[PDB]
Design a binder for this molecule. Structure first.
Ligand code: GLE
Ligand code: GLE
Ligand code: CA
Ligand code: CA
Lengths: 123, 123
């Protein structure tokens, strides 16, 4: 769910409030997403969005009541490393992987303040 | 919470249904507990019970709405190893530790079918 993803980014980037720092960034970070990513961080978000889309196609996900945003899964952060729990069922394990890859990506790319709340008339 | 503890024991003992195998065992495994533990597994349960008691004394726990049984915390199981998440707050981190130590203990001691549903008139 959204809360585990928030916690994953803080595990990788301890100094951030992700929901504040990464939501509404570029053409992909935030609900939805269209166009050409404006930068590398925006590219991370595009991959993550494709990952959730991939996930929804999954038979194990279509059976669940909740979508990738409210689908709680299990993970741990210890020493700034993320571990998706083996207790997660197929769908949850897939989302956890999507979220874990994005958190790592976020922590590896430059952040451009100018792309925050990006004028979606540039997407 | 009770559900994470259940999941922790299965992480260590993949062949079990803990709620079925370990509840109602000896004088300590299960809600409550009094007397002299009947065996090593029962001793594991006594330590775990003392651990929750310790936890409740904790200032950070007394502030919470829920007791150790319904207090959700975060952890992962990967390769049969348990990791308490660093996202857990003081109280949750303490319970997770209590639960993790008990799961490991359970997996290290012999199980005696004869102590199941132990005649609490022997406690
Ligand atoms: C007017 C309403 C528009 C505002 C958007 C609603 C706010 C809810 C947030 C939804 O969250 C969208 C999102 C969150 O970004 C991650 C972070 F936790 F760090 F913010 O998914 P995405 O895959 O797009 O990010 C890569
Ligand atoms: C008539 C009602 C009595 C039945 C008991 C209620 C059932 C709810 C279970 C409560 O659970 C008690 C308990 C669970 O044992 C762990 C396991 F998940 F493996 F079962 O805590 P404890 O510290 O004592 O174990 C060491
Ligand atoms: Ca998006
Ligand atoms: Ca007990």
């Amino acid at each position: 769910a959204l809360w585990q993803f928030n916690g994953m980014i803080k595990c990788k980037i301890p100094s951030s409030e992700p929901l504040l720092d990464f939501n509404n960034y570029g053409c992909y970070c935030g609900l939805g997403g269209s166009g050409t990513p404006v930068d590398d961080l925006d590219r991370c978000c595009q991959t993550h969005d494709n990952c959730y889309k991939q996930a929804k196609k999954l038979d194990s996900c279509k059976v669940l009541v909740d979508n990738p945003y409210t689908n709680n899964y299990s993970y741990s952060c210890s020493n700034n490393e993320i571990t998706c729990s083996s207790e997660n069922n197929a769908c949850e394990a897939f989302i956890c992987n999507c979220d874990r890859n994005a958190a790592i990506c976020f922590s590896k790319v430059p952040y451009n303040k100018e792309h925050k709340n990006l004028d979606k008339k540039n997407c």
